[PDB]
């Protein structure tokens, strides 16, 4: 029953990311962090599957995904910083001007 338990660990991390999206309408920093949780859950699936199938392709992609996660976090926090600088606040009522 090993594989199912590893997979449900990754599953709960992914589900927690989805819930963090659902529960944080007014907190876009935690929306970003929830997205990072989802990416960690996928990275773990690749490692677990690579071990389970006795195949190295899962690990190569796991390293490359870690690179993608790093770059995406860097740029996301940059966009956060510039949005904050322009508005002086992070509240979602000040990032809703574009609509319709």
């Amino acid at each position: 029953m090993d594989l199912i338990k590893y997979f449900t660990f990754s599953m709960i991390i992914f589900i927690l990311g989805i819930w963090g999206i659902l529960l944080n309408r007014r907190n876009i920093l935690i929306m970003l962090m929830s997205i990072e949780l989802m990416l960690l859950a996928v990275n773990l699936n690749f490692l677990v599957f690579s071990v389970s199938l006795d195949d190295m392709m899962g690990q190569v992609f796991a390293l490359l995904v870690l690179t993608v996660a790093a770059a995406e976090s860097a740029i996301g926090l940059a966009i956060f910083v510039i949005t904050f600088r322009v508005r002086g606040t992070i509240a979602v009522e000040f990032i809703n001007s574009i609509q319709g």
């Binding site: 390293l63 870690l66 690179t67 790093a70 976090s73 860097a74 926090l77 940059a78 910083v81 904050f84 600088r85």
Partner: peptide, 21 residues
């Protein structure tokens, strides 16, 4: 807010990935 701490974090992240590879 001092942008240079964010920038030093960015550079550290890049070179940390370099040491990793």
């Amino acid at each position: 807010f001092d942008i240079r701490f964010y920038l030093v974090s960015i550079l550290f992240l890049i070179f940390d990935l370099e040491v990793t590879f």
